[PDB]
Amino acid sequence: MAHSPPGHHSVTGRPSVNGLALAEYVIYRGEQAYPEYLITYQIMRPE
Amino acid sequence: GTILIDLSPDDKEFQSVEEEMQSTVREHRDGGHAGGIFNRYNILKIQKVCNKKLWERYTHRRKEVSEENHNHANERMLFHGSPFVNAIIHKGFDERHAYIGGMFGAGIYFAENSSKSNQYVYGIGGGTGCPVHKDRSCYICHRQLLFCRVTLGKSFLQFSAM
Numbered sequence: 001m002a003h004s005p006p007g008h009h010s011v012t013g014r015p016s017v018n019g020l021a022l023a024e025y026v027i028y029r030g031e032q033a034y035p036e037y038l039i040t041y042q043i044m045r046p047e
Numbered sequence: 048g049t050i051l052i053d054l055s056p057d058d059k060e061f062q063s064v065e066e067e068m069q070s071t072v073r074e075h076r077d078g079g080h081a082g083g084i085f086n087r088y089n090i091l092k093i094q095k096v097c098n099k100k101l102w103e104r105y106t107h108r109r110k111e112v113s114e115e116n117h118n119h120a121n122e123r124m125l126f127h128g129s130p131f132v133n134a135i136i137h138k139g140f141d142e143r144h145a146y147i148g149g150m151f152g153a154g155i156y157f158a159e160n161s162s163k164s165n166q167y168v169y170g171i172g173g174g175t176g177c178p179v180h181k182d183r184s185c186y187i188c189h190r191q192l193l194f195c196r197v198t199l200g201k202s203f204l205q206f207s208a209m
């Protein structure tokens with residue numbers, strides 16, 4: 001596991017090409033997230 | 048230490064979590080290679096994850112970050128998909144959940160698009176797909192992902208050619 005950029009707590013990956021993609025984020029300490037909801041699901045075949 | 052509480056589909060909490068799942072599906076540039084071809088999910092169950100020690104670990108760190116960032120934790124709710132979801136809920140996130148080779152360094156990755164985290168449920172790039180059918184687009188097998196509370200604090204902004 002790497003470090004955060006100096007003086008930052010996380011990284012925001014902001015898609016610059018695909019205008020419809022939303023952001024992705026990276027943290028470098030496990031204590032900075034809490035797994036609050038577990039979601040059980042199937043993907044659905046389009047009709 | 049962890050207990051899982053089933054939420055009723057009638058509960059406002061279930062419905063707002065489901066809404067976040069469904070409304071953040073997008074098309075992917077691999078045409079469904081990694082996570083399958085789909086526009087929506089069949090939600091089977093939503094459980095609240097309850098662990099005192101892991102929660103207190105989280106809020107202690109959140110306060111430290113907040114204090115280093117003009118009293119702003121910059122807390123989000125974000126999706127995480129992983130073959131290790133069962134370890135995560137019992138033991139918390141750690142370096143064994145790090146995407147060593149990811150775009151923005153060796154860290155733990157989260158997404159606003161549920162369909163992005165879905166590409167990681169069976170491993171990096173969808174791995175070999177579901178355990179039963181070896182199918183990255185399996186419509187039968189049950190998948191699981193996490194909807195997580197994440198402290199971002201001061202976040203480095205990286206524009207990416209994605």
Ligand SMILES: O=c1cc(-c2ccc(O)cc2)oc2cc(O)cc(O)c12
Pocket residue numbers: 024126127128129130144145146147149156157158163164165167171
């Ligand atoms: O939900 C995510 C999960 C993971 C992931 C990546 C590697 C692992 O060994 C375990 C999980 O990567 C990601 C990478 C992204 O760019 C965005 C994500 O949401 C995820």
Ligand SMILES: [Zn+2]
Pocket residue numbers: 177178179180181182185186187188
């Ligand atoms: Zn399957």
